[PDB]
């Protein structure tokens, strides 16, 4: 159906086995709903030692990705992708990823994800080769590979066939009925589907209010949600 | 020195090869600065088919992790960890991870990371077994493994020997001197270390202001930073 092709530029393509070989994403790859293809800048070097890093102009402690191997790898991935592929660079300086941003990225049938190492890539390559710069969160990692895999996993959930409202999820319970003295809320045993739906929605509203109140500010609550939230806040007091 | 031990509870322990076998984190593991030990709930099942999921009370589309295998795996990891280990559950409902939160978590010499699959774990296990619940970002994934690896990588950077201010990083440049007509800022060639430091700081301030203005609100800028930021905003106008 709406399959997705993701090209990856990475010095450590074997890291991507974590998503291509296991779980829901591994099944998506096996079933051809998701295709992940990697190019390694090390394969585009020409010197004896296959050098992939370079020193920044102006000095400093860190290194950058060497331009020539990385640029050639990107160009090769773009040629394999054809037209319509969006090239994404993962960095702390990028647009912060959220579920809304995931749904936007999932609209692309083709993506190329550039995984920086060291202190990242040359600023001019961002200008000449990168369409969009994204961050998975306000923290620093040793490479863009984990952010790239996180993005792949999140967008894969929107591909039809891969899987089997602004609020945090409600609590969930399974067997057994009592666990270290803690019982399951009786409503979940009642079999009354409408009471269960309202209980879960009310719990999601209460949990969002208590834990992430700023998420509620970005929402236009329905009539039902306004009432259940008021009830939850009244019981809390 | 300040080595770190991280126990992991996961149905897919082989995903963690992505951090234990490659790059800076793989070296940290090889050098015994970081130890990652995994327990798989599937090994704690007793039925013929090694069942690790269970149905939620109250119905619904999703499944939960089965309590008994997961609980036994957690208890085994806690016994291997000894005293002082903090047990962390990765979920979208958790505290949002940022670099400040990474530095807090890195203060622990021992961590146990519980990786949920399906719709997560029973709420009572969070109450009885989990010390802290964290999220790597406001998006949903197919498992907690990628969040757990992201956390491991971020905290590993604070372990002394693993590697070789609230603002986004400045642009960086490497060879060649001209790339598709784009030149390197002459100051970075000048060799004047003080001018380079001020240029980079000014660029970091300008970039944070243009891209993530809310990050500036949480900062008490130094005298030098206030001046360079004013200069950047004046040149922008
Ligand atoms: C200092 O490292 C870099 C510097 C610049 C670019 C890439 C890297 C690689 N590391 C990353 C990558 C992405 C994210 C994120 N928040 O999306 C976090 N870390
Ligand atoms: C619906 O999935 C779950 C539901 C509940 C718990 C765990 C999972 C596993 N998936 C995750 C895990 C963590 C994060 C995060 N933002 O840290 C995102 N997704």
From Swiss-Prot, chains A, B:
EC number(s) given by UniProt: 2.1.1.228
Key word Ribonucleoprotein present: no
One GO MF term attached to the UniProt entry: tRNA (guanine(37)-N1)-methyltransferase activity
Annotated S-adenosyl-L-methionine binding sites: 89, 116, 136-141
Localization in the cell: Cytoplasm
Pfam family, one: tRNA_m1G_MT
Ion transport as UniProt keyword: no
This protein's GO CC annotations: cytosol
Enzyme class: transferase
Keywords: Cytoplasm, Methyltransferase, S-adenosyl-L-methionine, Transferase, tRNA processing
Any GO BP annotation: tRNA N1-guanine methylation
UniProt cross-references to HAMAP family, sorted A to Z: TrmD
Family: Belongs to the RNA methyltransferase TrmD family.
Oligomeric form and interacting partners: Homodimer.
Entry function: Specifically methylates guanosine-37 in various tRNAs.
Name of the molecule in the record: tRNA (guanine-N(1)-)-methyltransferase
Native organism: Haemophilus influenzae (strain ATCC 51907 / DSM 11121 / KW20 / Rd)
Organism ancestry: Bacteria, Pseudomonadati, Pseudomonadota, Gammaproteobacteria, Pasteurellales
């Amino acid at each position: 159906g709406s399959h997705m092709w993701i090209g990856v530029i990475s010095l450590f393509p074997e890291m991507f086995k974590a998503i291509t070989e296991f779980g829901v994403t591994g099944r998506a790859v096996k079933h051809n709903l998701l295709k992940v293809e990697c190019w390694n800048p090390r394969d585009f070097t020409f010197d004896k030692h296959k050098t992939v890093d370079d020193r920044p102009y102006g000095g400093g402690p860190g290194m950058l990705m060497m331009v020539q191997p990385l640029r050639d790898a990107i160009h090769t991935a773009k040629a394999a992708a054809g037209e319509g592929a969006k090239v994404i660079y993962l960095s702390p300086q990028g647009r912060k990823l959220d579920q809304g941003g995931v749904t936007e990225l999932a609209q692309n049938q083709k993506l190329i994800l550039v995984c920086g190492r060291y202190e990242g890539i040359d600023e001019r390559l961002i200008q000449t080769e990168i369409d969009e710069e994204w961050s998975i969160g306000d923290y620093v990692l040793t490479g863009g590979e984990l952010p790239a895999m996180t993005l792949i996993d999140a967008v894969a959930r929107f591909i039809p066939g891969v899987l089997g409202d602004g609020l945090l999820d409600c609590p969930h319970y399974t067997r057994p009925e009592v666990l270290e003295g803690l019982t399951v809320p009786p409503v979940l045993m009642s079999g009354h589907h409408e009471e269960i739906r309202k209980w879960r929605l009310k719990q999601s509203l209460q949990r969002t209010w208590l834990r992430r109140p700023e998420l509620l500010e970005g929402l236009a609550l329905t009539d039902e949600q306004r009432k259940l939230l008021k009830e939850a806040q009244a019981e809390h007091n």
